[PDB]
RNA sequence: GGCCAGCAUCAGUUUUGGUGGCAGGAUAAAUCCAUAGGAAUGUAGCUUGCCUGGUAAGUAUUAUAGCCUGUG
RNA sequence: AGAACUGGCGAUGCGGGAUGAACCGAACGUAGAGUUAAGGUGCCGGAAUACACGCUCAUCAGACACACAAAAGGUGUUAGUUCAUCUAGACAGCCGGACGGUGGCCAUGGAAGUCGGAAUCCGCUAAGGAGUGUGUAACAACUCACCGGCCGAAUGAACUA
RNA sequence: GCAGUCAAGCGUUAGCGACAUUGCUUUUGAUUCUUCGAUGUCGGCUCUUCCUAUCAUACCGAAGCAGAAUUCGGUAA
RNA sequence: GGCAUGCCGCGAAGCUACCAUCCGCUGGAUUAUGGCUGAACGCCUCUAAGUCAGAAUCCAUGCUAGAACGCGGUGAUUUCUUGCUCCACACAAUAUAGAUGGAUACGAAUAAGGCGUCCUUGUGGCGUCGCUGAACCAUAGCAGGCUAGCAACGGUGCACUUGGCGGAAAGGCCUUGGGUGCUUGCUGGCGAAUUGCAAUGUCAUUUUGCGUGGGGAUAAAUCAUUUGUAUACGACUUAGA
């Protein structure tokens, strides 16, 4: 019979860092452009969403139904630094990594730990070499022209413009898709500074794989007949694979949270607020299901690393109406007008 | 006679090229291996993925992590090999081994270094012909050593820029033998001839 | 006025090389020379079909090579 | 199971046998020199990865208290014995003959040789089975038992290690 | 098993003996209504680990296997 | 308002659920099996040589942890503990799994190759070599002195300087320009003693510290407060010049 989980999956000790590292990335499909193989953000709760579905040969086609969906934060990023690998028999090895130079506080506070104590001798010294008319940063390019076979980029999470306010933010590698490392490295030099749109990297029933760590429960630790004679639970990488985007969260304009069916104009913003979260006010990813950890806990996008030919990825979604009901309790309204449409006027009105 | 040796894999017997090295590594002499994915095991390929399934197979019974690491690497392999003929649990068995590099290809700077061979261990030269032998690479590459690709590209490049050394040296030492020719018949040729050389 | 070594030759144990003269075999035997013969895995030559100038067995037991046998 | 008889341990050190209280050797004070028994001379392991005649492909050979699952069997290998084929053309490979009474006699819708079954003849020759098989309602259709047309020098059968 | 039978081979070379072989081995799918002194602690829960002399799934194979479905040899833990 | 976790209906939240929801991979090598070519044996043949398709089998793709004694890159590294570091030498102690000339670089085949040559560039012809590296350089001066010239103007140590190549652990190699020593390639003027018939007779550096003098830089994390996504206890992740 079976056991008490999966021994593939044993031994279980706590994670070694909250963000979750990429373990591999998609295949590098020369002929594509040089486009971004995944994503980091900050998921913040759960809505049920209600749509109808193509799927011919299905108990419910042409039925509406009601399916679990997430929304995950991620507002624009911007590219702080390139990364080069070389082929070795002992693996990927990293070469050489270059900075514009013009990295905000965010990235320094993530650097440092007692920024408050800390003096502040951010790479200014180093900038120093490249505030001049340059030489140093083509001898940079040329020697991940010449090597690095494998390029990935590095970049970082604008954690102030999260809705949840806080000063350090995240940094982590991002390879790219593009034709011959000259194109990716060109490319990267390029988008140095410049912000990233989320939209660019995914679209409408994209297939999506990601990683996170799982909520900690603290510690873990009867039949006496174990051994023959001749302890934590949660806080871990996990990883979920074969999850559809339904739409694009493009959480800086008004008539996201709305279909064009219901049309109802408001944001996803569910009334009050998300629990233990601030409130949504840029970009955003909307995924069905679920990812493993809590609110405020970084995650990370990918594509599944190998396209999908199933009818499923294939079938389009055309939803209907998004719930953004207060999930601070038995929540009964959208918005405040339907409250208002309830109740009346109130003491407070008058 | 060398302070250090290099001897190529290629071409060799994997149990008298690690005894022998064993030898001359217990007497004080600095050896290093390379190209060891090249090096061959006398048998059918069959027959030596049997026997090293029979290795993998031993481990400490009840606690699976702190076995003996069932190496897949060519270069890991031989060392495993060498390890044996060597008293590993001695302090002069230890001293030996430190002495004892084993890379896969011919990385740098080895691969400017000169290279030999043992007469007594190439495969070619002991093995009858026709013979069944196996590969350590292809045994390593169907134990899960996913370099194989990796190393042919190293393999390659470090092949043509050798070969392009060569033709230069060549061009000069073609030189050097006209230059030596025409200087014959000099006296002091005449009494090097007369003297041995 | 002693202790530790080197050098030359010494007596015992013992190890590894060089060299000369003798006795024994079939008074070693092969090899070498002479003598009369035999054969082919036929030597020169001759002979028949083919064809650039070789080829095969037919003859040829030593001839423009040699072998063996018996004896001295 | 039981008898007389021999050796060792008993009372025992030492070299080797991975190690074995019964194995091989071996006359036990303290040191030096040189030669050996047993085991060997690829490493642990001190000694030739010595010469020479052959075998061994083994999916875990082989280095195993030698004891029995052990008798054969392998279109696996190496070496030998006997009996015949033979230039009155050695075995094997391509082509034809394979007849005539006859479709034998009894069984009977059909057994023309190949669903039943007794002998299997005589005529005839280089040779022909009242049939070896493949397949037919009934022959019919094809092969060899046996022979010849070409080849082209050793071959087939039973045993032993 | 016993007692033979044929006799590949060994034989004092009269005897042995491999494989087959005859007799125990309610002929009308009837009913035996049969289930005969185990002197011993083991028996059953859960989970793990190992074998294949493997039930399913998987692999292919031989069948009066036309399909459905069925009989069986083998690979595979 | 306390009291009898007094209770009642609701009740977030702590725990937690087939008693709720989202997902649960894809390329090769094989077993048995079906074949190819083709012998063995002048036939034949899936096997002896190779090879095709081929199992939930094997390897990786993917997943969890990560050598707590593996690795690469990146930023900083103390202004009055003036403390610290690089480089030229300057004395010491340290110890060398053990210097006592030189790791001298094609690859492929081993029933075949390297070199020069001819073209027709060929899987070509000719000559040349293996049958060991017992090979090539270099090796003369106090562990290598003080000097005179001869002809070459070559060989080579040394700091600058020009460009190129090298990422598998590159940290290495070649080279443009002269400058400064050696030159035993050749011939001469001198010291060798006494270190007593031998007592390795050292002149190789590994690291560390203080000194001179030309430059170089002006940080950290913890303690503590706090926070809670972490949380038995520890650890850990946030915020305050």
């Given at each position: ?14 994670a070694?860092?909250?963000?979750a ?7 590098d499909?020369?002929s594509?452009?040089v486009a971004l ?5 900050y ?10 579905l193509?799927r011919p ?7 509406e ?14 590219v ?30 993530r650097?440092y ?12 010294k ?8 340059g030489?140093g ?5 040329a020697?991940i ?16 413009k999260?809705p ?6 995240h940094?982590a590698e991002?390879?790219?898709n593009?034709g011959?490392?000259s194109?990716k ?9 410049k ?5 660019s990297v995914?679209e ?14 603290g510690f873990?630790?009867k039949?006496?007949c174990?051994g023959?004679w001749h ?7 996990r ?6 985007i ?18 109802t ?11 233990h979260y601030?409130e949504?006010?840029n970009?955003?990813?909307?995924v ?12 990370t ?6 396209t999908?030919?199933?009818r499923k990825?294939?079938?389009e979604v ?17 918005t405040?007008?339907?409250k208002h ?9 008058l | ?5 290099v ?21 004080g ?20 993925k ?15 992590t702190?076995?003996?690491?069932h ?6 392999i031989?060392?495993k ?8 649990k ?16 011919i990385?740098?700077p080895?691969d400017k270094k ?7 261990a ?13 590969t350590?690479?292809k045994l390593?590459?169907?134990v899960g050593w996913?370099?194989?690709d ?8 470090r092949?043509v820029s ?6 230069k040296?060549?061009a000069?030492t ?9 200087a ?7 009494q090097?001839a007369?003297?041995?050389?």
């Amino acid at each position: 019979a079976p056991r008490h989980g999966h021994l593939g999956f044993l031994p279980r000790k706590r994670a070694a860092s909250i963000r979750a590292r990429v373990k591999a990335f998609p295949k590098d499909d020369r002929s594509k452009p040089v486009a971004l193989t995944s994503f980091l953000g900050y998921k913040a709760g759960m809505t049920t969403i209600v749509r109808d579905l193509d799927r011919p040969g299905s108990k419910f086609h042409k039925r509406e139904v009601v399916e679990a969906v997430t929304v995950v934060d991620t507002p624009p990023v911007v590219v702080v630094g390139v990364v080069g690998y070389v082929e070795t028999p002992r693996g990927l090895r990293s070469l050489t990594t270059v900075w514009a130079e013009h990295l905000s506080d965010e990235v320094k506070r993530r650097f440092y730990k007692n920024w408050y104590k800390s003096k502040k001798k951010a790479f200014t010294k180093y900038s120093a070499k490249y505030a001049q008319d340059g030489a140093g940063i083509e001898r940079e390019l040329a020697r991940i022209k010449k090597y690095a076979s494998v390029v990935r980029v590095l970049v970082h999470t604008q954690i102030r413009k999260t809705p949840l306010a806080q000063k350090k933010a995240h940094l982590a590698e991002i390879q790219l898709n593009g034709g011959s490392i000259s194109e990716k490295v060109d490319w990267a030099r390029e988008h140095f500074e410049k912000t990233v749109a989320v939209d660019s990297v995914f679209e409408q029933n994209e297939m999506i794989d990601a990683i996170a760590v799982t909520k900690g429960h603290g510690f873990e630790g009867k039949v006496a007949c174990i051994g023959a004679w001749h302890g934590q639970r949660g806080y871990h990488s996990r990883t979920s694979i074969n999850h559809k985007i339904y739409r694009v969260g493009k959480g800086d304009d008004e008539a996201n949270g709305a279909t064009s069916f219901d049309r109802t104009k408001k944001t996803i913003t569910p009334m009050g607020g998300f629990v233990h979260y601030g409130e949504i006010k840029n970009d955003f990813i909307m995924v069905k299901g679920c990812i493993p950890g809590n609110r405020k806990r970084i995650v990370t996008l990918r594509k599944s690393l190998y396209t999908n030919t199933s009818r499923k990825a294939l079938e389009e979604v055309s939803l209907k109406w998004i719930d953004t009901a207060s999930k601070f309790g038995k929540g009964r309204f959208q918005t405040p007008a339907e409250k208002h449409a309830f109740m009346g006027t109130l003491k407070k009105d008058l | 006679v060398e302070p250090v040796v290099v001897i190529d894999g290629k071409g060799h017997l994997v149990g008298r090229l690690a005894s022998v090295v064993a030898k001359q590594l217990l007497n004080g002499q600095k050896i290093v291996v390379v190209r060891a994915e090249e090096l061959n095991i006398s048998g059918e390929f069959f027959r030596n993925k049997l026997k090293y399934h029979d290795f993998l197979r031993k481990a400490t019974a009840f606690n699976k992590t702190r076995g003996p690491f069932h190496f897949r690497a060519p270069s890991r392999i031989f060392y495993k090999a060498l390890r044996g003929m060597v008293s590993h649990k001695t302090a002069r068995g230890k001293a030996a081994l430190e002495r004892l590099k084993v890379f896969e290809g011919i990385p740098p700077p080895y691969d400017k270094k000169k290279r030999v061979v043992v007469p007594q261990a190439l495969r070619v030269l002991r093995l009858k012909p026709g013979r069944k032998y196996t590969t350590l690479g292809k045994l390593s590459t169907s134990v899960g050593w996913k370099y194989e690709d990796v190393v042919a590209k190293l393999e390659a490049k470090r092949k043509v820029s050798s070969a392009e050394y060569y033709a230069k040296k060549r061009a000069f030492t073609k030189k050097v033998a006209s230059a030596n020719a025409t200087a014959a018949e000099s006296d002091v040729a005449k009494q090097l001839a007369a003297l041995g050389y």
